[PDB]
Amino acid sequence: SHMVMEKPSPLLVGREFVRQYYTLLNKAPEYLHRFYGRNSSYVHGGVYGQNDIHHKVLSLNFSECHTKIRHVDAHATLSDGVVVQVMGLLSNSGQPERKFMQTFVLAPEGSVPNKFYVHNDMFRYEDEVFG
């Protein structure tokens, strides 16, 4: 029983990504599109293409967005990718906290080497789905 040297642990890649993702969302939301490729999908309910994602984020207007991460779980998936499920609270522009469930699919960048990009991003508010 030894540690895998070839690939980074999926759980650490997910947690570190979530940490940086929501941090940048609070700081500079306009640079958030740099996490996605020209084939990624962004859904914030409430889109395929990085340029469409950039315009999508700006249309949401994130002004000092604070996030309380309640749960994060990340596993390894297809083609050495990482799938992450995130549950927590979201408060944007002074509005009160809203329970959400955001899921990511972290894909390894082409080359090289240990670089990842968001291949899938699905965001859903709880009060809009259940009530």
Binding site: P8, L12, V13, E16, F17, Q20, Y21, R34, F35, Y36, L106, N114, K115, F116, Y117, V118
Partner: peptide, 8 residues
Amino acid sequence: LTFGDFDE
């Protein structure tokens, strides 16, 4: 471990 076009 880097994400996107960042060196952080």
